[PDB]
């Protein structure tokens, strides 16, 4: 009875999505001229990790960037001069995510230890020590992002997300509803709402203040590994293990466009956007990072040069450079 | 060209590089072992023998060789996503209990826990990330298994076994079935040892299997394999 009601309601929502769509996005955006071949040359090569890098995050000053490695190290890098600024030894070697604060005071990290470590960088003593440890997730942490210097949203492998208060140490808001492991999360520029994708081939848009699921986007065939908001904040691209990428609009509430090609069958580790948003950058398991034209679903460039599986990719706030991290322990900056 | 602060920053970067190289060498000498099995296998007991939420890390030093053992049993999450982290592992120590076949989980569909352990070992062995990784197989509760095979025949759980009731024959048959679960015999050794209440005998077998793995890695590094 309740299941039949759910089937009826989802059929009505599917009919509303069908009736709402009138013109294909590719047909409308076919008029604009193509950008052409975009070639990005390596500027800097970062070395000394000596282990499998999993996560990088750009700072808001567009110069410093944090990186997380499997040897138990967070390395904070000066990207212009190639010098290392900080080297934080970690209590647990197994790490899967790291966040750099917008102010630059704090660095978060997390992984298979079910603990989120917050490190203060502006201490008077001069040694980066453990400031605050978040604790209470029943699954492995997959992503963390600093909304503010006191509040942080983390996603975990117990199908849950949480909004934590750093000074208190307790979790304030708990987001539940996903049936699969939530693999990533992305913050909109306003920071009022955030979308997160899970291993049930769905993404969900959660309002922070409300604490309830604002929207739900389905359409993928496999586990969603990456998610990223557009600069305007009304759209977000998702990457999944089914060798396809998708673009979802919040207001339209339907699949705008699909990025895929026949030769590539491997998954999408990470996705990001440029400052304009015209170019969608995504690293795949084929040892490459492909730059797609977002408005025409065509490939604009290929970034080859990593010798192992590319794990993470990040565009800086001004958009001057793109830094990719791969499993060969080399961080490469492409301009 | 560079200012004094820039030169001091370069000197700081060189000191950090020296510390990272020293830490990388110290981590490179360490032998990593991944511990797997069911909850009822007896992981805690054998870890306490070898010593004397998330990842449980055990540090011990045998014959001037450092071992770090990673117990992943606490996590309830899907294994497929976080299993790729353990790609660079020397060996997987997989522990199961011989007495599991009589024990049955409280489910509407009566299922043998031994077949669940067989499915778990088949899933770990046929994993794409673990093709050249050796498995050290530990069979637990030998005395209770002997008392049980004396008290109850092994024919009841699966009809395929027609051997006469014998502890040695039943143990050999379980061992050869576990070895037959392997689908790539040439590139993956399976070391089967019956667990006993002796601290020396287990750790020495683990040391011998790790020594064989280091021999294999050194021969691959030199280029013979």
């Amino acid at each position, epitope marked *: 009875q309740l299941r039949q009601e759910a089937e009826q309601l989802k059929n009505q929502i599917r009919d509303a999505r069908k009736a709402c769509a009138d013109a294909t996005l590719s047909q409308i955006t076919n008029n604009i001229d193509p950008v052409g071949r975009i070639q990005m040359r390596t500027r800097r090569t970062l070395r000394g990790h000596l282990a499998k890098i999993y996560a990088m995050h750009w700072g808001t000053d567009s110069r410093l960037l944090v990186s997380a490695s499997q040897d138990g190290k967070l390395i904070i890098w000066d990207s212009y001069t190639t010098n290392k600024v900080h080297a934080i030894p970690l209590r647990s070697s197994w790490v899967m995510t790291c966040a750099y604060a917008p102010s630059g005071n704090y660095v978060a990290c997390g992984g298979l230890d079910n603990i989120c470590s917050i490190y203060n960088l502006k201490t008077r003593e001069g040694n980066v020590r453990v400031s605050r440890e978040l604790a209470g997730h029943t699954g492995y942490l997959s992503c963390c992002r600093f909304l503010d210097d006191n509040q942080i949203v983390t996603s975990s492998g117990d199908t849950t997300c949480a909004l934590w208060d750093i000074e208190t140490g307790q979790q304030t808001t708990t987001f539940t509803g996903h049936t699969g492991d939530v693999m990533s999360l992305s913050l909109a520029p306003d920071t009022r709402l955030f979308v997160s994708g899970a291993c049930d081939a769905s993404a969900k848009l959660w309002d922070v203040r409300e604490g309830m699921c604002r929207q739900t986007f389905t359409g993928h065939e496999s586990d969603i590994n990456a998610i990223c908001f557009f600069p305007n904040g009304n759209a977000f691209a998702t990457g999944s293990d089914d060798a396809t990428c998708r673009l979802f609009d919040l207001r339209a509430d339907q699949e705008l466009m699909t990025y895929s090609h026949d030769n590539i069958i491997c998954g999408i580790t990470s996705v990001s956007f440029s400052k304009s948003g015209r170019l969608l950058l995504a690293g795949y398991d084929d040892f490459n990072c492909n730059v797609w034209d977002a408005l025409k679903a065509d490939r604009a460039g290929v970034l080859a040069g990593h010798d192992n599986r590319v794990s993470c990719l990040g565009v800086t706030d001004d958009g001057m450079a793109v830094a990719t991290g791969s499993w060969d322990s080399f961080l490469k900056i492409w301009n | 060209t560079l200012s004094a602060e820039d030169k001091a920053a370069v000197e*700081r970067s060189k*000191m950090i590089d020296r510390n990272l190289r020293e830490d990388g060498e110290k981590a490179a000498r360490e032998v990593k072992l991944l511990l797997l099995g069911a909850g009822e296998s007896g992981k805690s007991t054998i870890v306490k023998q070898m010593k004397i939420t998330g990842i449980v890390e055990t540090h011990f030093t045998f014959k001037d060789l450092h071992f770090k053992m990673f117990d992943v049993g606490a996590q309830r999450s899907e294994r497929k996503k976080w299993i790729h982290c353990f790609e660079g592992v020397t060996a997987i120590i997989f522990c199961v209990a011989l007495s599991d076949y009589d024990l049955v989980l409280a489910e509407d569909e009566e299922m043998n826990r031994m077949h669940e352990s067989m499915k778990l070992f088949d899933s770990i062995c046929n994993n794409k990330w673990f093709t050249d990784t050796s498995i050290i197989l530990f069979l637990n509760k030998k005395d209770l298994f002997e008392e049980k095979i004396k008290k109850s025949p092994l024919t009841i759980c699966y009809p395929e076994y027609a051997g006469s009731n014998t502890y040695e024959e039943a143990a050999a048959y379980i061992q050869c079935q576990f070895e037959d679960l392997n689908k790539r015999k040439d590139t993956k050794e399976i070391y089967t040892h019956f667990t006993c209440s002796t601290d020396t005998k287990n750790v020495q077998f683990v040391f011998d299997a790790v020594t064989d793995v280091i021999i294999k890695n050194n021969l691959k590094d030199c280029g013979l394999f």
Partner: single-chain antibody
Amino acid sequence: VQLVESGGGLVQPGGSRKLSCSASGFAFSSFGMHWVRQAPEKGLEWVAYISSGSGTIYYADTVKGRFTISRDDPKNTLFLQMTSLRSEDTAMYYCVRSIYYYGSSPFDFWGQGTTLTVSASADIVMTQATSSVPVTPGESVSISCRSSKSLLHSNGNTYLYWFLQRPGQSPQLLIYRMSNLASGVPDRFSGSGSGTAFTLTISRLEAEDVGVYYCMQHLEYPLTFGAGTKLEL
């Protein structure tokens, strides 16, 4: 964070003396150390620098040879060896910790000072044009500094630091790199200007700000200080 110096007292000329500065409550091994001297009725003067890990060592040209600087990291002690002292060395010596990276605030913490009395590339000249300005509490105060060489480096940083020494207390850092305020300094102070012409503006003058203001270049060794603008009421 605390630095205390020992080894003071009167010294005969031509003798030798070994000062020791002990550090507490911070990672001594990661900070570079500066020795700064101050005459009784004159301005400050830089003596020496040792990097963290003892990789590079710098001296002023007037103190080259006679003064030896060392450090012991397991005991967290900075050692200064002085041989063949002269009549110009009757000064108070301060120890300074300084860390150098992108976004760091060097010269932030100053020692307490040990008194020693003895009884019988072009050097960038920093010019304090004025010597004393009588001020009233409440008005905005302007202090001017000038250089002999353009401190604007090609990376965009201008290596000018503003220090305040209160009467009878250790000097504190106010401004590093002419724009950024040091941690713990109120927003009353602001630095502005360009190459060869720098200005410190104190809007809403408040008590305990009376002291001597120093402008320091940090473009190249040896470090040269200013004369020191003193305020009064």
